[model samples]
Target chain A: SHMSGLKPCVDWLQVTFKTGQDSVKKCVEKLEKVFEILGLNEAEFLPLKNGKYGYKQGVAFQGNPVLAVYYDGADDMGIHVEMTGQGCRLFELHTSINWYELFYRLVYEYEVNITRLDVAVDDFKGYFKINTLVKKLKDDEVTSRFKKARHIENIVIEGGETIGHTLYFGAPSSDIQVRFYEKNVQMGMDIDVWNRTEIQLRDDRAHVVAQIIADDVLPLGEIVAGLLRNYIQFRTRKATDKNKKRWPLARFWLNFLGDVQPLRIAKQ
Target chain B: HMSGLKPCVDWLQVTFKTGQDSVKKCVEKLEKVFEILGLNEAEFLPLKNGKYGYKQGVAFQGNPVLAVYYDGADDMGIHVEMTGQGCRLFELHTSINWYELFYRLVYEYEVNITRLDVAVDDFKGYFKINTLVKKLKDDEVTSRFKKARHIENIVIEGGETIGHTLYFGAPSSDIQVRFYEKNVQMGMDIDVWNRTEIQLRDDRAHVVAQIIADDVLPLGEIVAGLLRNYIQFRTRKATDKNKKRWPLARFWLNFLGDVQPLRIAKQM
Candidate 1:
């Protein structure tokens, strides 16, 4: 009994993928937004600055790739990741790819993916300043930029969605909205609003913040996500050599892609 | 039947004395520390124009004052009234002058002290932040701090008096103190500073968050304060709380000092 370990783990999957223009500032901004909105701070990241306290971050079949778990209220994390245009190129080059369908599939899969805490190392810190004031200013700036960068609306991954599926403050009332579609299939966006509105009224609403992700070309990206999942599952099951298996033992990298591996190895 | 309503006032003839400290950086540093300690920002009282808050200069005078008491454990509190300089740190005996402590604080923070009530060893001049009072354990300090309501500033008027104070925890402990002047007396006074401790902040709040004023909520707080006041007032009245007198005519007294409102607000 003394040898038994005790810790809390929450298996949940979160995703935030955007469309339209892809700039470094915008990409980094999205990354920063994800860490903040999801309520994850450096303390929760396991590898808390060279593992002063038994925690680490890295790639795994379940915990790696996506590699985002544990959250603390301390530490202001600058943008740590950048979005690349390689996916866009791949989609453009692949003639059979249905872009809209891909985005839809990604959203669907992200919703279904279960995220769990890797208890041995996860310790979410509490009491982070919500920065509601700064965020409000940023929102104002975003509106002005949107007017100039005009299209019916630029496709965006929900700032709220990057954190999780919880809607941000006033998200229900914001005039800016998203529509979901999969090529010819309009999977529906109104339902998203209705469901989120209900969540917003709940007692623990402070912890919820999500975006209504657009589902046009968004699907093109999402389907690629689905295909990747299939590929990993195939590699994991068929790999003859255990050490040579392409699928990481931790799950995070599966969602985050390849970058999470180094964090994992560095911990060991 | 309704007869008449009238405002009331009284004047004390004692001259005032004061002191000051340059606490701008002190206040800011403390605010940062409070942030690290996970204090609710809602509890802050800001000074002039500053990022975290304000820094104020303090002055003290003799006055009629009210006191607020607080318990860190169950979070209980009460109030008292006195006139004169608050209790100060005394090397001869271990008593706290609540008002004098408040005076030095006023110079450090914001918040106006409309009135102050304290128990001091001498009902003569204004006081300052004396080491004697600061050395008193947190329970006594917390109780005195909580005694004031809508505290813009806290004032104290106390003089030599020993009342047996009663507090809870650790099998039970008791102290016997006797009053020589001010005709003040306490019986069976118990202090509970051993097993429990007060959670101090560099601000006005005692660990609460965001004020949402829905009709019912505001009404609820008002009703609760009134009800609590009525019940305690009745109980003390029935017991003739002050009548539990001491027989000895000569002895040393203990005074607990005050934390002024200006000092608290400036730190916000």
Candidate 2:
């Protein structure tokens, strides 16, 4: 009820980078500059159970751990960040704006290319809502349209107790989920490039799936930007209409920086 | 996109105080409860404004507003809107209504329900009402009552805010409402019970709403026994379901005691 705690509403994003020719140290150096531009500072390196160098809490803004950076040896880095009503109280930047700026500076200014970008927006909007998707599946015409457009051969749908609907299209690696009512929607596609040169059989198959997704509907980058706007609206629930109008700029940055080259994943 | 923050989904709460025979009297009573609970005082305003206080105006992707309908003899309830991070808004409204509707349920042929539970999704950008209430005492009874759940569920989703009256223990003991949008579907499940077993979404509406009197007996039995035990427990008498009505326990038990009988009256 009125008790105090972080609200359940959220928009989450995670990105992994394989530095390749650029070493982890070099990438970290670039990230340091990006963090500086975003008004963030690196705190003390936090220890972890598995391996040392789990640098998260160390990256703080106003003494709060807003972002975490993890280094796997010399070439791979994982970055994590979160935004909540309570957490945002400590920062001047809106959660969505913060994400846009951070990612934007990292990619464009520092040239930190992304390897894998995984993102999801929950409780954001109703157009692409899970409930709507579930309802759409009930219509043969809609389902058939999607099947034909995506070139999906086998589509499996299941309903659960609390989990709600789970739909899988194409191979397991493709990882596409569809839904209906207080539902969650998620999609994951794999793009792997073997030896940084030749496209192996598994990687080639993932490329095919990625292309199918790219052609069937809107671009993933555009979807990510739309989700970012949704999160911005949620964070500024009490803002006046005139003030809220400023969010379209945040959307622009999200689309610009959040764009991922799915084909590049296979060509990496 | 699971990039930086958790996806944002909202659970909103709105309460209405319908003034019929005595507007001044009800407003005063509503004021007293709101004062006790540290809430806002009511004011004179039109349905589109004050009456529409029950309406939720959310600005997101679609900029959707959700309002309830009550078709009766005259324009009735004055709405009061309260927005919270999660499900707290629902709990607050429930507390305020327990005393008001409890008295109405016993005295009048019709009782005004303090309805709450409207959620907003930023990504999808729509207002949602997904509430399911069943008696926990009998799973079978609950399922039987829920057999027509799809009908009622759909009614709310269809966006028709019509108010229709039904007798619980008297003539009509069950109500059915159905809604289907572009193939997504849901229905309402109506039944009677000693306790209110409602499933509130996203902000853990169900768990937080539950209260316990005694560790020895089930909550349903205690809530069922409240009507019989309330008078005795207040006078320092111990009962099977309680040693004393723990201050915290009274709210839940009283609410259940009041809401149950009327709903049960509309049995199939």
Candidate 3:
């Protein structure tokens, strides 16, 4: 499953996810079961298989899963569930994967960069000038991304703009923010004990959680860009596992953190 | 009341009988009378300055005129009484001025150029493109003519092939041909005649008539354009009078000839 071994989600969501093995079909089914166990209704669970009820690469995914789920992710959390893992639960199973680690792994594998772009509309023409953080990924995905982007051009009009402004980080104070912290930060750097366990086998759900977190702030365009980001990560990791160095503490947080104050406050 | 005009059956008919001198004022008064009598119901009679009316321009020693007298000769014989002798009988009066005459002349003359004998296949597109190129862009003629220039360059997509064929002349023959080639470039002419003929007089009735013909196609365009052509013929004579000697007989004959032709020709 996408968030495998991710029991009661604590913190840190992913922008993308990939199965460590060729078990996407089983993984998808397992994910559905996890949502069912969580009492989420069918509508709350979108089984994204392109054109086949299950997300396919072409018809549904438009020949690529990276393209299919381009504008998805409006699933709502019915109630906020505060996490307090005192059951001696395996930290790895309780906490989610550090999204920042996953992001780098993907970047190195795909040979593409995840960029932060500040695109502002200036003229009445609805024209934008994009300032990109990582121009490398942008250059690589220009063609595929444009194919997806053409749809936006039609919906996005000038003069009377109704939509087209989704930032990459959701609300600075929200459950996804709090949860991201509880899930990804293993042993507090100050405490220095391997209090968190490593991800168990047959668990790949952290990626979905991370993506949900990513969707909160990432615009439709960026959400789509994120899909490509993951694909690059998958292919690049396969080329050479050399970059798969076991992370001690991921140098950067992958999931977009909203409430950094909460982590600081909790420590205080 | 002393004039014994008796306010004929309608202001229009009565206006003419009011010795031509009485026209402007009678037309104004008849608007009230016509409205009261319900005789102003005709669609052709638009309320202008609160009444149905026509204005006068250029005075001529022998201006163009049309006369329909059933009792003059044979029952069906329509006599175009513009000769001096005939003019005296009906009290000939100058109906238009020099500038108006010139505008009408140019409009009509151009329309005649689009006849089938001069046109080829795809004539509409060619005519549109050529006209657009020649006129360039002068902002005078009214009714948002700017959009009028883009008809030749529209593209079709999504299972639909936008194939349009335009014939610029009469139904009997081709004057021009128009084919959609890729994208259109604004290969327009920004010359003297182009500027004046296309833009300056755009607000003129004659010019508007020609434009309607160009856009509407077939009978409607031809009819209106041809009427403008009549105005063109009269204006040309008016122009000649100002430049050189005015031939009374020539003007009379030309007016008569038009009437004769219309009278004898089978109803089209």
- A98 Cα displacement, candidate 3 (Å): 28
CAPRI quality level assigned to candidate 1 from its DockQ score: incorrect
CA lDDT, candidate 1, residue A44: 36
Q: A12-88 in candidate 3: lDDT tens per residue? A: 21122233335323222233333232233334333233221111111111122221121111121111111123211
Residue B188 alpha-carbon offset, candidate 3, angstroms:
24
Ranking by TM-score: 2, 3, 1
Candidate 3 docking class: incorrect
Stretches > 4 Å off in candidate 2: A1-10, A16-27, A30-34, A43-66, A72-100, A116-132, A144-268, B1-268
Worst 10 residues of 1 chain A by lDDT: A114-123
Q: How far is B16's C-alpha from truth in model 1 (Å)?
A: 22
**Fnat by candidate, in order:** 0.00, 0.00, 0.00
All models, RMSD in angstroms: 26.5, 25.2, 29.4
- Tens-digit lDDT track of model 2 for A44-73: 324332211222212334444433343332
Model 1, runs deviating above 4 Å? A1-197, A200-212, A216-268, B1-100, B106-268
Put down candidate 3 lDDT per residue, B1-268, tens digits, no spaces: 0111010000001111222332122222323332322222232222111111121111122232212111111111111122223223222232432223223333322211111111111111212333322222221111211122112211111112121222122223221222122222224332111100111112333343343334333322332243233222111244453412433234323422332221101111
Per-model DockQ against the true two-chain complex: 0.01, 0.01, 0.01
Candidate 1 has a TM-score of 0.16
